[PDB]
């Protein structure tokens, strides 16, 4: 949902390549995200990384469990931990 | 049907060339879609790509299975996954 | 018959030159259809293309098999595939 | 009426294919409108799209409700929303 | 009657070939109407198409029901729908 | 008069359908003008549109005020504005 | 109004994708705006984003409150805050 | 005059949509200019934009003052500033 | 002469509207050439533009000097420069 | 004389209606020429237009000056300019 | 002969005006062919162009050499090249 | 032959201008192909480019060697290399 | 104002991250400023930090008091203390 | 003049954003220059910045004094100081 | 084949310019690929680089040996080494 | 000649705007080349820039000396230096 | 919270590597913090060490107890002891 | 594999230049890794060093033996020694 | 002022930590000065200590009295005593 | 030649700015190379620096002597010394 | 000149911050030089410091006297003393 | 393990060079440890000496026996003797 | 060679400044090596000193004799004496 993903889009930041690697993105896909949205900035790169993960996983794969696991390996567990448990 | 294809037409977007390649379009056909409907925009290009796939496949080939496979290879499984399973 | 040809006349559209070429029309015949019925529109051009194919082939050549083959090469198999098999 | 349709004819513009699709036009009919009135311009194409919708629907179908629904799906609700409610 | 047919004669226009085809005219009859009254214009062609339909059908066939059906298939239902129901 | 109408006939051009619609021509009348004088060109179509407006309005309706209003709605006010006020 | 929207069109700039996302645009619509008006520049993209928001919302939705909320979430509150309160 | 408008036609260029918006063109009119003269190029689009402004304004509105104001808001004041004051 | 005009007819091309404007054609005359000979193509439009210039100017005006000046302003000086000086 | 009128009869062509209008023919007279000699072709229509001008003007009105003026307004000055001055 | 001219009549097509110009037809003669046989179509126009060339040239001028030269300048050398050399 | 040219017509695509330039087409001829068949699309432009090359070269020039050389310079050697050598 | 902010933009320097943190910027926003304007340098990063603070706060929040407090916590009170009190 | 501006265009470089800010460009205008001409490089961005300054200022504002002041504030006084005083 | 080239298209990425240089592309060709497909992204650029290599080399040059050599010099031997030997 | 210009057309590339500026193209002409041939790519833009320079200069201006000077100022002297002196 | 962590960020200082080791940072993570933020200084390194600890631990691990234990082992108990107990 | 390389990517750290030198990277390649991924940090540099080693060596060279030898010379044998033998 | 602070910057030396402590610097700030400017030397550390004192105190706190008191407690009264009283 | 320049392109590295300065590049040209090819990396910057030197010098200036002198001043004499003398 | 500044650029070294301070650089400008060119090294920082001094001072301020004074205060008088007086 | 090495890291102290020599460190490695971590202190030097011993020895060499022998020769047997036997 | 230089790189150590001075490095070059590679350590400084000596001397100067002389003056003759004579 939009509320379940807005904090991740807004507060992920410079570690988007690591998060993408933990989310199953190949190096070529990270290169495409880095290249296509260079003109729009880092916020666009993070948004498009999350969006392309959603498109790739559909509704069956875009689960909270897999996102939580990916963020835990990425060490960015603050995002989902705050968003879901605090709210 | 119209309900089975409206979300794909409306939400496919910038990846229409990749989806067309996964749907069996030759490079010349993609060039024709890109050239003929440049004056109408990206929405028209996506609509005409889906429409020409339907004309090419008839009713025997325009099956949900082949569209699902093509979207899975295109990595745009969110479209059909949301449309069919969520609704 | 009229029922076997009305959907093709009504839903063929902008690809009438390609369909005519796959139906055995020479370039001069396509020029004559394009020139004579410019004042009546695209619907008249498509109708006259089908009608002139019928006159040229008689009843021995105006078969479902040859029309199906011509539409398959034209990639407009949706027309006959829907009309004959769906109905 | 003429006053209920003049703003739609004058201010619809480049989205006439989408509006026609939401109004029930088949792809062949859109091709005929695009082909026949290419020599007169976009204004003629929009005018003829609205006019052919009126002819197809008669007086029983050319209702404000169906036009409003079609414009809402087309996302061009500004036309009818301004014309009817503002005036 | 004259009042039941004057609006159709006056407001039918460029779609007279399609209306004639839906009214049962063979292609040769449409050719004769197009050829004989080329010197008088489109209004004469439309008038003679309606008149020849009346002569062919007599009083037993020149019914409102068949004309309404033919106009509905021709998509020109505005003519009879306005004339009969509005007045 | 001839001097009050020659610049309009000579310099109206491609917008003759819009001007005819603003002058009270029905769609069928525009179709007849477009069809009858296709063999003579656009200049003949414009001349016959103005001439048929004059015949329809007589001398009581063929006034400068109504022509000025029709040209203003058509956005072709340059014609009459230059002709009458400049000369 | 034109005065209520000119400063937003002129001074929004590189954050148009974020503003569009906060205004309810789907990713496909942002792709269409980015693709269609690439030949005209960033100013055209911003203008068309605002214009398409106006068309989508009509007069009932194109309110100052919703635009203010969208700009506040986009963090571009300077636009409307200066325009409305300063003037 | 021709000398007062030739430099504007020749040297306006890619900013023709902005200049048209500052000259009072609605979005639909800009769409018609962009669509009709796509086959002739940008020079034709600029020429037709200026020409349609002249037709719309007549001789009473096609004044140097309004053109100067429109160019000043468009930020293309070099055109008229050079043409009129330098020569 | 035929030899003095064949290279201009054969090699003028897409810039025929600009050349016609530099040759003294009004916008209505260019509209008539564009409309009448749409069915024959661009070669016919260029041929008829040159031919109508010859008819308008007679033998007293159809001079090499005026054609050279018109081509120089049109920037198509290659035509006459090659034809006359090279041969 | 026959030599002073043969080139005009032979080389006037498709602009005979415009030349007739510039020669003082009413619209009804042009209709009669167009209708009576439809079976003989365009050459007969042009010949009869010139002949009826001669009959109407007698020998006092069938002067070179008035024909030259009429051709100049018709823009077909090539005819008389070549015939009289070149020979 | 009939065999030496049937392929040219059948396969010449839309370039009949250019071929007529290369065959020595004046513009008025092309206008007469275009006007007289508009009711019969393009095939009749091409047939009558060839026939009138034969009548004009007699048997002394209707030679293979001049027809070959005219087709070579017209760029339609496929007609005679195939007909004479292939057969 | 048809089999020797169908793959080139079907799979040439966006590089048709370059292929035409390598095939000896002047810029005006490319402009005519681009302008005349804009209403039919890119497939028609490619088909007409090949067809006009065939007409220009006859049977003596439409050789495999010259087409192979032209495709080699155009860098589209895949077309003929696959068609002739693979089959 | 420009004079109230130019010294801060020009003389803030290496402590821009600390100043941004004291101004309410999240870590992701600082990452975006650091990433987007790496190609332009430190001056651009400082300018964009101040500019984005202004956009975020509007005119109601971009007060001297809050900027003074933020600079005092950042320990860069020399900037505003010199600018406002000295001048 | 071209000589008074070529050294500034050629030797301004990476400080074009600062120079544009000192020349009166708003942040949105700098964003448009940065976005539109990203595909052409830094030289194009600098050229278009100077060109748009010239268009905005006309001939009355594009003075040496204002450019010198803007370069002095930008600290790029070497450009104009060398160009004007050294030469 | 498609299976022999899909991994290279999908996993080549940011080093496409180096791979193109090792594949024999001139700098202008790399510029054309970079410019034409900027609107579609890096994936399209890589796909079109491989496709244009295939067109340039035909079936005689598009060999596994030359691709392997080019990838070895490019240092991207993982692509072909994994694809061919692992599978 | 074709051999004197083919290497320049093939190997000029991304610097076509700079070369056009050094060749005397106004900014509007560069805008027209960039806009008209966006659908065909960079190769078409370079080809049309050279072609329009040739048309503008005729045979008297399209000299090797002026092209060499323009390339020297553009810093692309490799093109002509290699082509003329090496061959 | 911000108040519970500001004194630790501001007053930790040169012992940040020891504190990071007591907080569970691997040597590679300390190397990344030391390397990435060398350009910003020691304050940035300390801030990013605390921030990355917060991201790693989420809200479940970023407890006062674990921070107190880590500071006690680091021997920097003054920070938290003063902050929490004194205030 | 991913499990055979994740500990090396995560725990290599500041000695990446030495490890790259022992892995066969030239000084220029180390410069490119250091320069390209300066904006992403040390983790990205280490990841890209390992990734580029994998691409360079393919599957035939990316063996455990060579990596073990390179780590032994680099003195970072803890990485592979722990990963492979401990697990 | 610069003259009131140059002798202190130049002649303070090894006692900069003591002077900073007497000037109100916390231990963390002294650590940051010692760490950040280790690469530039002791002169840079002293300069940055004085500069950061100036930034912290603004113009209201950077008084001669407080500096004199701080130097007196630091026992470095020679600096200010010589500078102010001797000069 | 390619063999005389490949080692310089491959092994020049981080000193490309110094080498460019010794090769006669102005600071603006180095800024353009640094800015345009930031998205492709250091290898692209070095390649484009060498390529632009070749374009600037042509074949008359791109001599081994000048490159050797430039590398000697740059202190990178290993490149050319190894390449030419060792091989 | 280049010879008057090369020894200063090459032999200034670690004291570039002190020299910049004596040359009138503010602390923010030194921060920008230190930050922007950290990726290129100390040589680039020294070169850019001298270059920015030249740009700031123009030709009127970039005098030998002021540079000599700045170096004398910086205590680096060896540079200019050797360069100018020894040579 | 961490518990088997924490007392050695915490209580080794000033004899770290002797312990490193007994642990197999070359003099250059001791110089690197002394130089790199001079800014962090003696604790960092001892920690990095132990850590680099662990990396060098892996898990096969980082045994208790070799550490005990090295400490016995170093005469610091109190560390391991207390840690292992006392606990 | 690599074997002739690895022991010198690995075992030179803290005396790298003295060795660089004996190898002909100016003080500025030693400052650049000390400054650029401070983030990587002493091993990187020694490696880059040797590497830059190799680049400066090429293959003609990077002789064993000069390195032996430089090491003898540096008093580090153990390096080369052991490496060359012992092995």
From Swiss-Prot, chains A, B, C, D, E, F, G, H, I, J, K, L, M, N, O, P, Q, R, S, T, U, V, W:
Serine-threonine kinase which is a key regulator of TNF-mediated apoptosis, necroptosis and inflammatory pathways. Exhibits kinase activity-dependent functions that regulate cell death and kinase-independent scaffold functions regulating inflammatory signaling and cell survival. Has kinase-independent scaffold functions: upon binding of TNF to TNFR1, RIPK1 is recruited to the TNF-R1 signaling complex (TNF-RSC also known as complex I) where it acts as a scaffold protein promoting cell survival, in part, by activating the canonical NF-kappa-B pathway. Disruption phenotype: Mice exhibit severe multi-organ inflammation and systemic cell death, which causes lethality of animals late in gestation or shortly after birth. Perinatal lethality observed in Ripk1 knockout mice is rescued in knockout mice lacking both Ripk1 and Ripk3; mice however die the first days of postnatal life. Perinatal lethality observed in Ripk1 knockout mice is rescued in knockout mice lacking both Ripk1 and Casp8; mice however die the first days of postnatal life. Only mice lacking Ripk1, Ripk3 and Casp8 survive past weaning and rescue lethality caused by the absence of Ripk1. Belongs to the protein kinase superfamily. TKL Ser/Thr protein kinase family. Induction: In concanavalin A-treated splenocytes. This is Receptor-interacting serine/threonine-protein kinase 1. The chain holds residues 568 to 654 of 656 of the full protein. Residues 1-87 form the Death domain. It comes from Mus musculus. Cleavage is crucial for limiting TNF-induced apoptosis, necroptosis and inflammatory response. Cleavage abolishes NF-kappa-B activation and enhances the interaction of TRADD with FADD. Proteolytically cleaved by CASP6 during intrinsic apoptosis. Homodimer. Interacts (via RIP homotypic interaction motif) with RIPK3 (via RIP homotypic interaction motif); this interaction induces RIPK1 phosphorylation and formation of a RIPK1-RIPK3 necroptosis-inducing complex. Upon TNF-induced necrosis, the RIPK1-RIPK3 dimer further interacts with PGAM5 and MLKL; the formation of this complex leads to PGAM5 phosphorylation and increase in PGAM5 phosphatase activity. Interacts (via the death domain) with TNFRSF6 (via the death domain) and TRADD (via the death domain). Is recruited by TRADD to TNFRSF1A in a TNF-dependent process. The death domain mediates dimerization and activation of its kinase activity during necroptosis and apoptosis. It engages other DD-containing proteins as well as a central (intermediate) region important for NF-kB activation and RHIM-dependent signaling. The RIP homotypic interaction motif (RHIM) mediates interaction with the RHIM motif of RIPK1. Both motifs form a hetero-amyloid serpentine fold, stabilized by hydrophobic packing and featuring an unusual Cys-Ser ladder of alternating Ser (from RIPK1) and Cys (from RIPK3). It is found in: Cytoplasm; Cell membrane. Found at low levels in all tissues. It comes from the Eukaryota.
